[PDB]
RNA sequence: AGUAUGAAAAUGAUUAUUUUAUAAGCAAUCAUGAAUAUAUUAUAUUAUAUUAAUGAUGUACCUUUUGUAUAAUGGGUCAGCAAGUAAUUAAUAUUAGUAAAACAAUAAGUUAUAAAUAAAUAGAAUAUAUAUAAAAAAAUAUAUUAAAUAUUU
RNA sequence: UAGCCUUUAUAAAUAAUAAUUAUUAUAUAAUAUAUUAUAUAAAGAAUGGUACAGCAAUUAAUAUAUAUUAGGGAACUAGUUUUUUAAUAAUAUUAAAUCUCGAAAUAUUUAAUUAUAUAUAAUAAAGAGUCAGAUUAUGUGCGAUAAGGUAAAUAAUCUAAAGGGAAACAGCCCAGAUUAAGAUAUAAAGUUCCUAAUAAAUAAUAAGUGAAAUAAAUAUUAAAAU
RNA sequence: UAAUAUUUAAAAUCAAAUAUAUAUAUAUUUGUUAAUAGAUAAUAUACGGAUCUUAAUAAUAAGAAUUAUUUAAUUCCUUGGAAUAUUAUAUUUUAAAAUAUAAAUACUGAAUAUCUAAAUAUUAUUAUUACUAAUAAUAAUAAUAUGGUAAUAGAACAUUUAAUGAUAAUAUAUAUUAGUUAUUAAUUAAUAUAUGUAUUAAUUAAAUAGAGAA
RNA sequence: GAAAGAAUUAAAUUAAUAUAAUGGUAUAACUGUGCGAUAAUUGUAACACAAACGAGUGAAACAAGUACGUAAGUAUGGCAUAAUGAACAAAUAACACUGAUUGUAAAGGUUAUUGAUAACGAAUAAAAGUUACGCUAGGGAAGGGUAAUAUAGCGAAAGAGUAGAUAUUGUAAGCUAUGUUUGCCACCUUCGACUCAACAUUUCCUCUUGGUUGUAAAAGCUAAGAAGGGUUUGACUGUUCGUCAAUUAAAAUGUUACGUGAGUUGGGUUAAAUACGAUGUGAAUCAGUAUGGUUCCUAUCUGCUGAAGGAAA
């Protein structure tokens, strides 16, 4: 199991213990989304900047690669060359 | 002095997000207790439906989440009452209260159990 | 204050295009009609340029400040001139030359090649051996140093 | 000079940052009244004396047809009773910057583990600038629980931060602008028009109360509950 | 049920909800007044302003823009489904009735995030080009980073002088206008003025090397 | 069942601690006693705490000697935290370290010790005033905030009022409003007179009204509405103010940079002269007194008073 962690809130006029928090869970910028494995420390963690943090729990993580790859928008087209 | 105009009420509007605000607290909490009961469930030896599935839901051994699900500590959106959602107790105030909408940060900050006769 | 030349600007008059006599504020920016000008591919239902219809946005610039639209400093405009340089040294770095030597090579000399001590006739084999200082018969103890089939630092 | 900043680099380098485990008890199961495993509860290794709470000791305050110690006044024949005066004792109640017997949270903080390594720490060789700060919130001292006052503490922002909101706005609320583009999520704030965007439900208000800066004691009128 | 004297309470009590064994018990959570007066100064009313409190008879139609508690039609069960209702549309049937469909994801809102491209730097993967090729140049993919005063670090451009140095009046230099290249610069075209023509391109060396701030 | 011993438990604690306050202390550091006057000794001190540096603090261990102790051991002064002062220049001893041609010396050094800079990180061995005759560089390293005081108002009512708190009065205490006084803060660097006034209302007069054993009337007192009109001339003083005089229906209180000095004046008031009293040794000084005594401005824009030209009627 994994969670996936978003950082919804952003960290300015957050006192400098949360942000410290925040960027050892690996979240570096608002928005940013992290996929963490779930042990107790982790959501202890999470718990502490609660306020900041959107969770949801997930079935498998993904790679930044394949986050981008879902990302992505339809380009609504196909190319052909002549 | 210098005009902050800032008023001694929320308007509507401010209370509702405040309370989308802490319903999503609560929210989190619940998601990160319901991930911990699916890890166990993992490590004891069950799939992850199965997990979902199960009646006898662990709860968590850590203390600070622990806490965090005790109503009587953490309440909930539905629990709480109207007069801690946009009120919080100010030792040197008028009625001893004043609007949450006035503390510093007040949108990242949590603060649900006011004093208990206060 | 040389001689030529001079479509450099500020500044004046004038003419053209355009906007302007119910409209209010750093005079711009963005949106956006209309009018005019030019264009040897405007084929046009064209493209650029100019222009304060109209709408929105928009407290000059510097200095000094906790902080300036400030009714704090400074400037009428334009043109020209106006401010981190040199010498003699020292220490660090980088790169180059040479290298257990380097520079200079007339002889000197400078730095390196041995650490230490106020100074003195003292001074180097894994360290637990050794060197110097205080101490001492000699060790210990403290500080710093040197020391590991080979080719010295 | 230290603190805060930068450049270059070093490594038998993860030391850095964050959390977790660490304790106590209950129930169940298994081994020898003990030990392990699983579950659950408990503000949960160690350090502490602020709030709160308390009146113990210390320092203060109150009340007794209570008790004792003496005194003043009084009756009858020095003894006696009552009315007390003060002190001490008893019982009850109370508070405090320099009282804390109970006692939080936040905090300091330890080893291992997990996460942060395009990351943090340490060290080496070089450089700086800064040493009249401001406001907001919280807990204070000084002031008169005055000040856009003053002095420090903690956090943020401003300083050095443009953008959206707070009518206008250094310091508030959100959010950190490499350059565009403008489809999708949105933050704080809003949605009759000005002005981008709105529809509902249940009550209350009749004063324009109120509608982004709440003015007090008190009085009147009504409404509920007993 | 009238009059009667306080109180403005969910502590107690009752009701409802959640968590533990569970039709009960235990523990926790939530639910208890409103007007008016009091009310007040000097350039001008001062919610930012307009303005906002609703009503039969009638509107394919308004009904707070205040205060309190809420929702994103209303109700139930556990984001979902169902029912109910509403609106809109279509079709059939006699302006109605029946059937089907859709809507129920409220919306606005930043230079936030994503998407969409572009630039730069770093880390990790590539591809092409050319004999520290373990390199360089360019192009991809993924990621992270790119506000900034004092300050530190790195890289460029303009101007002028010295070293080296082709070329040419169809050339050059300077100027104006319109283009071009992610553009303090240079280049293209037309135009005007020089000038038998660069201290010209480029690499070095240097500087009286860049001005709205005295 | 008794005696004795060993004790143990409770209370220990404000007694005592060389000395303030705090923390400690009976397992005693507190007290008594034997021995002893020795650890109130000598070289190296790692490592910590603290910390800008200079300094400070605890201290294991190694070596040399000493004291007490049967022994274990304990002692590098004091139960702990204050009890202090750099370098430089002098001075005294030890050291055998250099000895400016050599030898001696002198002089310097090493080790140990001495006296102070209390403005206590100490400028020199050695140092006070005044300037209104002053000058240079700079900085600002009445308004705004507050409302303690002031004024004004309310709530409650002790008490006055020939009786009776509430006609009229209204202690001390309460709750407010104003920013007209005396202050506080440090964002920011002139009083009067004349002229002209504009605005406010917490109304002095005039208009309407309620209460008034204290409204017989007339005069009043007090309160509500009301800002339309009006609200003074002299002697004194620089005065605003104030004391009088004469009037008046009344001679209200403010705000306007305590309105108005690019509109006037300059009597007061902070310069140069001089004098008096006071203070100072004196130069000089003053919450003193007195005579004299210095700024100017043609109006660019706003604004206002008038007067035209253009114009869309
Ligand atoms: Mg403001
Ligand atoms: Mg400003
Ligand atoms: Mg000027
Ligand atoms: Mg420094
Ligand atoms: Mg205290
Ligand atoms: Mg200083
Ligand atoms: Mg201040
Ligand atoms: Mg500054
Ligand atoms: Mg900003
Ligand atoms: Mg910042
Ligand atoms: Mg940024
Ligand atoms: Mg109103
Ligand atoms: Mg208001
Ligand atoms: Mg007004
Ligand atoms: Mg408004
Ligand atoms: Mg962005
Ligand atoms: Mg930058
Ligand atoms: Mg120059
Ligand atoms: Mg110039
Ligand atoms: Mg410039
Ligand atoms: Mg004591
Ligand atoms: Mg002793
Ligand atoms: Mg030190
Ligand atoms: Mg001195
Ligand atoms: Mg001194
Ligand atoms: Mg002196
Ligand atoms: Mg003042
Ligand atoms: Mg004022
Ligand atoms: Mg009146
Ligand atoms: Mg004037
Ligand atoms: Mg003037
Ligand atoms: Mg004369």
Redesign the interface.
Same mark, same amino acid.
């Given at each position: 199991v994994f969670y996936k962690v978003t950082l919804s809130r952003s960290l300015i006029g957050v006192p400098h213990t949360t942000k410290s928090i925040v960027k050892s869970l690996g979240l570096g910028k608002r928005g940013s989304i992290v996929y963490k494995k779930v042990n107790p420390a982790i959501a202890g963690s999470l718990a502490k900047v609660k306020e900041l943090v959107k969770v949801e729990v997930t079935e498998h993580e993904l790679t930044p690669s394949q986050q981008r790859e879902l990302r992505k928008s339809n380009p609504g087209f196909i190319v052909e060359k002549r | 002095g210098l005009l902050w105009k800032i008023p001694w009420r929320m308007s509507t509007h401010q209370k509702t997000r405040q309370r989308e605000?802490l319903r999503? +607290?609560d929210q +989190?909490?619940k998601?990160?207790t319901?991930? *911990?009961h +699916?890890?166990r469930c993992?490590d004891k030896g069950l799939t992850?439906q199965e997990?979902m599935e199960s009646k006898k839901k662990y709860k968590?051994? @850590?203390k @600070? *989440?622990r806490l *965090?699900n005790k109503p009587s500590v953490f309440p909930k959106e539905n629990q709480m009452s109207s007069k801690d959602k946009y009120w919080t107790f100010d030792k040197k105030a008028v009625g001893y209260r004043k609007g949450i909408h006035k503390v510093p &940060?007040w949108? &990242?900050? @949590?603060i649900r159990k006011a004093p208990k006769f206060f």
């Open positions: - | 605000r999503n +607290v +989190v909490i998601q990160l319901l991930g *911990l +699916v890890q993992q992850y997990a968590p051994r @850590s @600070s *989440l *965090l &940060k949108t &990242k900050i @949590s």
